């Protein structure tokens, strides 16, 4: 009436919960790159010679 060893298991199942990968879009930056410093339009000379 006691507990005895039974037949060895024939296989093992290991369960884990996993989600999946999306598409590669690689959206690097809101406003991207190093935007260049640049000329103010027209500007004009702010200096003249004497005479």
């Amino acid at each position: 009436g006691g507990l005895t060893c039974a037949s060895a298991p024939q296989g093992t199942l290991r369960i884990l919960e996993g989600p999946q990968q999306s598409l590669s879009g690689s959206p690097l930056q809101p406003i991207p790159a190093s935007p260049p410093p640049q000329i103010p339009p027209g500007l004009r000379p702010r200096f003249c010679a004497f005479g």
């Binding site: 006691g2 507990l3 005895t4 060893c5 024939q10 199942l13």
Partner: protein, 110 residues
Amino acid sequence: LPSARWQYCGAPDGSQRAVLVQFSNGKLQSPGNMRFTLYENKDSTNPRKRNQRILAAETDRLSYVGNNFGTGALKCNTLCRHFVGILNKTSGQMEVYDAELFNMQPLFSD
């Protein structure tokens, strides 16, 4: 690839559990001569104690004891859950039951 239809007949109240044993010192060469006795805590009113169980295995030379509580209770019994699947090869149906894992260890007292 070979697959089986999964069914959790499981435990009617969840009170029912199977019993898995693992020996800390390896595999038993002759598990057929071992007598296992499962002990349960008499206190059924304390939810903490009502699930405490002791599994004892007796051989001619040594005794093994496993418990599901205290230091001997190990992390795998909770972080993970163990089940036993009984596969009917003919029907392809796998019946799945809750299992309790006991880590067995040798008995000596001063």
